[PDB]
Amino acid sequence: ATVNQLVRKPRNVPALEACPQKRGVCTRVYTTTPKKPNSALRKVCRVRLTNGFEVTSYIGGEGHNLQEHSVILIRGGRVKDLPGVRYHTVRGALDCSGVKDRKQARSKYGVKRP
Amino acid sequence: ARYLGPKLKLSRREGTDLFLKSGVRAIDTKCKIEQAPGQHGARKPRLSDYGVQLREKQKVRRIYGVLERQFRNYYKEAARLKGNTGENLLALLEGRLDNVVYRMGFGATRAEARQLVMVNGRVVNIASYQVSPNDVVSIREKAKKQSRVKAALELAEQREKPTWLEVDAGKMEGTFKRKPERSDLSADINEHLIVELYSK
Amino acid sequence: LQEKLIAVNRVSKTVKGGRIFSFTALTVVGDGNGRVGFGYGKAREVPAAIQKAMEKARRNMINVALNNGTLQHPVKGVHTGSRVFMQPASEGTGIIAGGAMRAVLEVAGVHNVLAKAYGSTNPINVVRATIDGLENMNSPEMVAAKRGKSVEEI
Amino acid sequence: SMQDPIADMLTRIRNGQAANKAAVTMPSSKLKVAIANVLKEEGFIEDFKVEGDTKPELELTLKYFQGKAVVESIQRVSRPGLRIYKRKDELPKVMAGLGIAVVSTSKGVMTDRAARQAGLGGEIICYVA
Amino acid sequence: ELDAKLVADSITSQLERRVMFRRAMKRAVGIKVEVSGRLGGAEIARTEWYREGRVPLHTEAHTTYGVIGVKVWIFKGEI
RNA sequence: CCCGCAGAAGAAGCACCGGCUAACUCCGUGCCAGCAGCCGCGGUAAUACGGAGGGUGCAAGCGUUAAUCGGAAUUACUGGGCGUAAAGCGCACGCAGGCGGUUUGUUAAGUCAGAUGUGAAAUCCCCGGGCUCAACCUGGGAACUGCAUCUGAUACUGGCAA
RNA sequence: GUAAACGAUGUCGACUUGGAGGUUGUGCGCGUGGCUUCCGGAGCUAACGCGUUAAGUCGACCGCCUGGGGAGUACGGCCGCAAGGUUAAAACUCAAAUGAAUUGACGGGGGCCCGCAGUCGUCAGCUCGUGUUGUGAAAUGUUGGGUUAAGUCCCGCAACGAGCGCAACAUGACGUCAA
Ligand SMILES: CN(C)[C@@H]1C(O)=C(C(N)=O)C(=O)[C@@]2(O)C(O)=C3C(=O)c4c(O)cccc4[C@@](C)(O)[C@H]3C[C@@H]12
Ligand SMILES: [K+]
Ligand SMILES: [K+]
Ligand SMILES: [K+]
Ligand SMILES: [K+]
Ligand SMILES: [K+]
Ligand SMILES: [K+]
Ligand SMILES: [K+]
Ligand SMILES: [Mg+2]
Ligand SMILES: [Mg+2]
Ligand SMILES: [Mg+2]
Ligand SMILES: [Mg+2]
Ligand SMILES: [Mg+2]
Ligand SMILES: [Mg+2]
Ligand SMILES: [Mg+2]
Ligand SMILES: [Mg+2]
Ligand SMILES: [Mg+2]
Ligand SMILES: [Mg+2]
Ligand SMILES: [Mg+2]
Ligand SMILES: [Mg+2]
Ligand SMILES: [Mg+2]
Ligand SMILES: [Mg+2]
Ligand SMILES: [Mg+2]
Ligand SMILES: [Mg+2]
Ligand SMILES: [Mg+2]
Ligand SMILES: [Mg+2]
Ligand SMILES: [Mg+2]
Ligand SMILES: [Mg+2]
Ligand SMILES: [Mg+2]
Ligand SMILES: [Mg+2]
Ligand SMILES: [Mg+2]
Ligand SMILES: [Mg+2]
Ligand SMILES: [Mg+2]
Ligand SMILES: [Mg+2]
Ligand SMILES: [Mg+2]
Ligand SMILES: [Mg+2]
């Protein structure tokens, strides 16, 4: 572009609303299949946030305690093999329990020190 | 805020004597200086360019017991100061007072010397104090009945005592006369690797 | 001569039976005093490829007119998609360059330099760009010579 | 149309050197002669001469050292589409001082070194090395 | 060091003593040497070989990972 | 802040260890359970999942998430492109606009030089000083790249005249 | 009012080795203009290629691009009798999409040959060293003119040699099918 042209004319987590976490209520809790090449029953949940956005959130770790009308804290973080799953649930915050019988990376799964 | 762990492993991981032991007996008799620590110790893979730069930085740190936050602040100071950054960095570490208590021979180790923690006749209990040219460093009178300081000086009397300082007997004092040049220190530290690592 | 291995890459050609894997090795050699060459070797095994690269590097060395282990002036080098910039630096700066440029500059005997690789950072072309940059760098004497002046006049 | 005679002069030199021409000729002007004088005095060209009166032609004798052309690079800086002026303190160094910048000052066309010693800024005509 | 049986035994016993198979094979190397099996304790078993000079043919290490076969050909002149 | 008392006594965790990236083994599981920043890992010998042993990095913190700049020359003024990768209007005429061959004179708008005024203090930076050190506090300087005015220069650009 | 409206190459000007044509003027076989086609040098280019009709070296001004999709779509405006054109987004979704070139394989592509037309197959192949070419994957050698049952042999050739096969004295090359 020429100088004269430039003179004339110069040169993933939206539901958080630039907050580190948002609280929400589980409107559905289910499993879903990952895309190829993966195979599992991945534990997700639809969540209506305190700002009115409804989003799918991932429930990480081995075994969870969430129903419909469970109150959870979500954070950012997509799940690569579930298209349109852009958030993770924080384990050991609010209703969502710590992962049972974890001993490594305990602080990532809300598990108090044995 | 202190490494209070097994000390020989550091020299083993670095694969060189870091002068971290008292010297009641030989380093070879104490540990395997050839071998890196742990179950996979006799193994020695290729180390990356990053890995080399890291191990040089961790060498210069682990001698003095300076943790990363404080070491980073020395780098920043060395880069700020006029002239050669790598030389400025070593000069700053050599300028520390807690080297001096050990180096003059009052502690058997720097860890001991640090447990024991006067400059220009004023008490200073700070390991990180930068001692200046023409400053007299010295010991108190109240703790000259400790057997530690007696033993430590006999350990110190077998080493090559430093060649820009003046340790004395009895009243137990010495002048930081000048800052050391790079010629004074070991041609073994490749301090350009530390400069490069923090430039990254 | 100091010798440095910059990159090893597994390459492949297809045949009736399947794939034939082989290795390539990019190396630089230098005297640490303004002499540097690169070599590129290919073989079915990694150590053979490196040996071929090092032999090539030793015979294809060029001379660089250094100044105190830094450059004479800012230089640009280009090869294929790789465009490199290198600038003289003060003592104690070190080699502020990426790995491919760093290996070249180190064996050449450049201790102090500020560099940046633009465009493709493909090692094979970055090394050629770097050596291209160094070999066309002018000293004050040759500038004085070509212009028909004294060095103090330059 | 022809809108930068100085860029044209620089290009004639650049292309002449690349083609191993002994000399290059062009339509003369007072500013071209002033620049040619600087190139001669700094030893980039061997000689120049103006011939004519109504339509004067400037001839520049190019110089080669060891086969290679002596003008290794020559680039227009200030140009009709974007004029470039520098104060005395901000005068450019070409090739860390080994090249020249030609500067039009209120005391005539001269090198950056001569401008800096005279305490003058001006228009940066071109870089030569 | 030359006798084909001793060199075959030298390879197999070295593979039992955790010598890298290419080191044993290249040291053995008219000669050809093939070694085939779970080499380096690979899950995929592979064959490898090295020749030097002429081997005109027309003219077992009991490791932890399982059986690794070794074969040696030496052409030490005609007749 | 100092002196005295008692006794190692009252005081170490967090993340990570497939590559990128510093750090590897065994056991459990068997495309499941699960991991994942990106590529990917898991279908019976998994350094990638979970535990353990060992190790690496940080340390009264350590991780995670959010957010900004960087790397990104990936909006390119410095500093990029457009035959085929994204990119030349289907072609032309043409107002505004941008640009303008060559000589002399003049002007002094641009430009350049100097001076003066201003550009709060703090902050940043430099040399010092003070708290045992540090953070922090602080003396003087430098800087504030700017703006305005006045006095000059006249090569180049512009205006005017020929 | 749109086309692969294409040279997929904006307009104007200057400069920078050659060769062979076409077409159309003009001066004395030899010049000198205009337009145009093919090859190629430096240089340029990711490569393919471009190469004085530049994609080279520069200057002036304009138009346009900013991952693949969603989409040249929606909404709004303007234009149109209509068909529609023109201006022109977003949410959302993926970690690619793409260009050129390389080795194979494949073609209801071409040429030239062969066979009663464990395995492929006793098919005549398969490779390496060094050198050279290419930024590189790679290439060359091994292709080509002949000839042979045969990479058999001869002759040429940026290749020079060598190995395993062929042959010679049943013999199954490197490999393929997780057979
Ligand atoms: C704010 N600004 C003026 C925006 C703009 O710059 C536009 C552009 N093409 O550049 C619009 O189209 C913009 O002006 C514009 O018109 C927009 C829209 O029409 C819509 C509609 O109609 C429906 C959903 C979303 C949009 C939207 C987000 O694309 C709007 C963006 C507008
Ligand atoms: K999978
Ligand atoms: K630009
Ligand atoms: K004027
Ligand atoms: K090519
Ligand atoms: K236009
Ligand atoms: K998108
Ligand atoms: K070859
Ligand atoms: Mg702290
Ligand atoms: Mg080459
Ligand atoms: Mg790129
Ligand atoms: Mg590692
Ligand atoms: Mg297992
Ligand atoms: Mg971020
Ligand atoms: Mg940027
Ligand atoms: Mg681009
Ligand atoms: Mg296309
Ligand atoms: Mg296109
Ligand atoms: Mg067009
Ligand atoms: Mg027009
Ligand atoms: Mg003009
Ligand atoms: Mg003025
Ligand atoms: Mg201020
Ligand atoms: Mg004028
Ligand atoms: Mg169209
Ligand atoms: Mg047409
Ligand atoms: Mg056509
Ligand atoms: Mg088009
Ligand atoms: Mg026509
Ligand atoms: Mg051509
Ligand atoms: Mg439409
Ligand atoms: Mg419309
Ligand atoms: Mg073949
Ligand atoms: Mg043969
Ligand atoms: Mg031949
Ligand atoms: Mg036979």
PDB file of N, CA, C and O (backbone and C1' of nucleotides) and ligand atoms in Angstrom, chain F residues 82-88, chain G residues 8, ligand 18:
ATOM      1  P     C F  82       3.826 -10.464  -4.513  1.00  0.00           P
ATOM      2  O5'   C F  82       2.336 -10.328  -5.077  1.00  0.00           O
ATOM      3  C5'   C F  82       1.463 -11.470  -5.032  1.00  0.00           C
ATOM      4  C4'   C F  82       0.107 -11.052  -5.528  1.00  0.00           C
ATOM      5  C3'   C F  82       0.055 -10.339  -6.884  1.00  0.00           C
ATOM      6  O3'   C F  82       0.019 -11.277  -7.949  1.00  0.00           O
ATOM      7  C1'   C F  82      -1.280  -9.187  -5.293  1.00  0.00           C
ATOM      8  P     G F  83       1.263 -11.388  -8.956  1.00  0.00           P
ATOM      9  O5'   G F  83       0.736 -12.402 -10.066  1.00  0.00           O
ATOM     10  C5'   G F  83      -0.263 -11.972 -11.000  1.00  0.00           C
ATOM     11  C4'   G F  83      -0.513 -13.111 -11.954  1.00  0.00           C
ATOM     12  C3'   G F  83      -0.743 -14.484 -11.314  1.00  0.00           C
ATOM     13  O3'   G F  83      -2.147 -14.617 -11.194  1.00  0.00           O
ATOM     14  C1'   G F  83       1.039 -14.617 -12.879  1.00  0.00           C
ATOM     15  P     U F  84      -2.863 -15.233  -9.906  1.00  0.00           P
ATOM     16  O5'   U F  84      -2.399 -16.752  -9.945  1.00  0.00           O
ATOM     17  C5'   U F  84      -3.093 -17.689 -10.778  1.00  0.00           C
ATOM     18  C4'   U F  84      -2.501 -19.051 -10.556  1.00  0.00           C
ATOM     19  C3'   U F  84      -2.379 -19.494  -9.094  1.00  0.00           C
ATOM     20  O3'   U F  84      -3.594 -20.087  -8.659  1.00  0.00           O
ATOM     21  C1'   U F  84      -0.329 -19.851 -10.231  1.00  0.00           C
ATOM     22  P     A F  85      -4.464 -19.506  -7.441  1.00  0.00           P
ATOM     23  O5'   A F  85      -3.632 -20.026  -6.181  1.00  0.00           O
ATOM     24  C5'   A F  85      -2.473 -19.310  -5.720  1.00  0.00           C
ATOM     25  C4'   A F  85      -2.248 -19.699  -4.278  1.00  0.00           C
ATOM     26  C3'   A F  85      -2.953 -18.850  -3.219  1.00  0.00           C
ATOM     27  O3'   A F  85      -4.288 -19.314  -3.035  1.00  0.00           O
ATOM     28  C1'   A F  85      -0.722 -19.503  -2.548  1.00  0.00           C
ATOM     29  P     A F  86      -5.574 -18.453  -3.481  1.00  0.00           P
ATOM     30  O5'   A F  86      -5.838 -17.610  -2.147  1.00  0.00           O
ATOM     31  C5'   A F  86      -7.181 -17.263  -1.727  1.00  0.00           C
ATOM     32  C4'   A F  86      -7.205 -15.813  -1.311  1.00  0.00           C
ATOM     33  C3'   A F  86      -6.732 -14.816  -2.371  1.00  0.00           C
ATOM     34  O3'   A F  86      -7.859 -14.546  -3.189  1.00  0.00           O
ATOM     35  C1'   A F  86      -5.668 -14.353  -0.300  1.00  0.00           C
ATOM     36  P     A F  87      -7.743 -14.417  -4.783  1.00  0.00           P
ATOM     37  O5'   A F  87      -7.307 -12.888  -4.814  1.00  0.00           O
ATOM     38  C5'   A F  87      -8.190 -11.863  -4.305  1.00  0.00           C
ATOM     39  C4'   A F  87      -7.387 -10.588  -4.210  1.00  0.00           C
ATOM     40  C3'   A F  87      -6.675 -10.166  -5.500  1.00  0.00           C
ATOM     41  O3'   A F  87      -7.543  -9.294  -6.198  1.00  0.00           O
ATOM     42  C1'   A F  87      -5.136 -10.152  -3.673  1.00  0.00           C
ATOM     43  P     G F  88      -8.060  -9.630  -7.677  1.00  0.00           P
ATOM     44  O5'   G F  88      -6.725  -9.501  -8.546  1.00  0.00           O
ATOM     45  C5'   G F  88      -5.968  -8.267  -8.521  1.00  0.00           C
ATOM     46  C4'   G F  88      -6.522  -7.334  -9.564  1.00  0.00           C
ATOM     47  C3'   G F  88      -6.284  -7.737 -11.020  1.00  0.00           C
ATOM     48  O3'   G F  88      -7.188  -7.027 -11.850  1.00  0.00           O
ATOM     49  C1'   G F  88      -5.008  -5.843 -10.561  1.00  0.00           C
TER      50        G F  88
ATOM     51  P     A G   8      -2.460 -16.437 -18.270  1.00  0.00           P
ATOM     52  O5'   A G   8      -3.615 -15.982 -17.264  1.00  0.00           O
ATOM     53  C5'   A G   8      -3.267 -15.138 -16.148  1.00  0.00           C
ATOM     54  C4'   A G   8      -4.452 -14.287 -15.787  1.00  0.00           C
ATOM     55  C3'   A G   8      -4.260 -13.406 -14.553  1.00  0.00           C
ATOM     56  O3'   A G   8      -5.166 -12.316 -14.555  1.00  0.00           O
ATOM     57  C1'   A G   8      -5.708 -15.230 -14.051  1.00  0.00           C
TER      58        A G   8
HETATM   59 MG    MG H  18      -5.571 -16.586  -6.399  1.00  0.00          MG
END
